[PDB]
Structures are given as C-alpha cells and as structure tokens.
Amino acid sequence: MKEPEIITVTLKKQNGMGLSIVAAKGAGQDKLGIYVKSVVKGGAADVDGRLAAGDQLLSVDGRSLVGLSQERAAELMTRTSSVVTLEVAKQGA
C-alpha cells in the first residue's frame, strides 16, 4: 500500500465496451469493487487502449458505484450515454 494511481478516461461508445470484471471484498469494506478480469477484442477500451486486466474500478459515467452488485455495476456501466467516464486504478501484487 502506497497510494495507487486512479484516473478517469473519457471515451465514446462505438458499439460496446467488450471486457470482463470481478467483484472482490475484504476487511473493513462495506462496499464492492468492480475489478477487471479481461478485455474483449474490438472493444472501446481495447481499441483505444486505456484499461487492462487486473485493475480496479471506482466511478463510471460520473456515478459513485461504491457498494453495488456486479449485476447492477456491469449493467449500469454498459447502460451509459455516448460519453463514458471510467475511473480505473493502477496497482497489482
């Protein structure tokens, strides 16, 4: 632990995102983080090249999705407008 690198990318949905995410919990955590598991080819994030597998999500489309289920998290993420603001963190063990 030494303060990760969180950043939000502003991209437009051409025809979907095409990626994978997994919910993980721990101690002293009353919420759930939408981590990244993989990225589908030809996706808005894959083609542009911003996020990668093994990352952590915080905010999507300017929405504080801190403490939601994967279903509500992923669903809301894909359920965004033309503009998308995904805030991913830089880390790894």
Binding site: G18, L19, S20, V22, A23, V40, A74, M77
Partner: peptide, 6 residues
C-alpha cells in the same frame, strides 16, 4: 466473485 462482461 463472478466474471461478467460489460
């Protein structure tokens, strides 16, 4: 702890 696709 599942893996969905958005």
């Amino acid at each position: 702890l599942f893996s969905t696709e958005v």
